[PDB]
């Protein structure tokens, strides 16, 4: 239903920015989760991941994201924490919530978690 | 895999918009339904459309539809609204992190 | 044939046959919003 995030953050390159990912109305266990970002100037790219019955966390292989996902299902709060930041990291990220299982979805969407790594 | 969708349209109220999203290597679905439709609207967090293309419902307005064959996936919006256009997305399926697509906004003029 | 019901209602109207499909509870559109409803929890046969 609701996505709540953790708020912005500005690194430099290299490091590693945590979030979180707050969930609001629904049960955070079951249902996947994931983290996306929606960068500047760019398409919706799925990066992060998480299973809900399981731990799944695989990514776009091709550069890692790399970003540390883990859940607390007691505070219902998925993390990013992103490993190998760079100055593309500046982005606004969604952690997003997956349907019941089918040809998707992500029903709803996190407000965004404004992310600007640079000098 | 990697997919293609139509950019933008510039069209007039009460109208269709014809989405055309374009799937690079694999095209659709095994089992015949796949994809899917999204949306992000300006200013806004991103939204949920149509799944496997043919599909979704009730949360997502009777204007939203279409279908897909293959590769290309057609998000048929009719009686376009000029407060109801906004960038929209589709997800793979099937193969590779599911991304989305370069995104598809249908303008409207008067 | 084999269900008794207290109430009967029966709404008789025109539509466009591509409207035909449109009506549905679920199923929204020009029709379901503007010019006659579906209830959302509807139950019961329609016959076009």
């Known amino acids: 239903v609701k996505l709540v995030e953790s708020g912005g953050g500005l690194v430099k390159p290299g490091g590693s920015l945590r979030l979180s990912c707050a969930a609001s109305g629904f049960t955070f266990t079951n249902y996947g989760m994931s983290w996306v970002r929606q960068a500047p100037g760019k398409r919706l790219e799925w990066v992060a991941e998480?299973?809900?019955?399981?731990?799944?966390?695989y990514y776009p292989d091709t550069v890692t994201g790399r970003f540390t996902i883990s859940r607390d299902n007691a505070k219902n709060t998925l993390y990013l924490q992103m490993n190998s930041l760079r100055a593309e990291d500046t982005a606004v990220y969604y952690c997003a919530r997956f349907r019941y299982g089918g040809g998707g979805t992500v029903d709803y969407w996190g407000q965004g978690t404004l992310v600007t790594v640079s000098s | 895999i990697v997919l293609t969708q139509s950019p933008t349209l510039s069209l007039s109220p009460g109208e269709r918009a014809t989405l055309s999203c374009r799937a690079s290597?694999?095209?659709?679905?095994?089992?015949?339904?796949?994809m899917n439709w999204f949306q992000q609207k300006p200013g806004q967090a991103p939204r949920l459309l149509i799944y496997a293309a043919s599909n979704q419902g009730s949360g997502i307005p009777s204007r939203f539809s279409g279908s897909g064959s293959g590769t290309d996936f057609s998000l048929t919006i009719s009686s376009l609204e000029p407060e109801d256009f906004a960038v929209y997305f589709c997800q793979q399926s099937k193969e590779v992190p599911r991304i989305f697509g370069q995104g598809t906004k249908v303008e409207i003029l008067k | 044939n084999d269900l008794c019901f207290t109430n009967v209602y029966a709404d008789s109207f025109v539509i466009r046959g591509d409207e035909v499909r449109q009506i549905a509870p679920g199923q929204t559109g020009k029709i379901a919003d503007y010019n006659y409803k579906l209830p959302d929890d509807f139950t019961g046969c329609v016959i076009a």
């Open positions: 998480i299973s809900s019955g399981g731990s799944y966390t």
């Open positions: 290597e694999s095209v659709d679905n095994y089992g015949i339904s796949f």
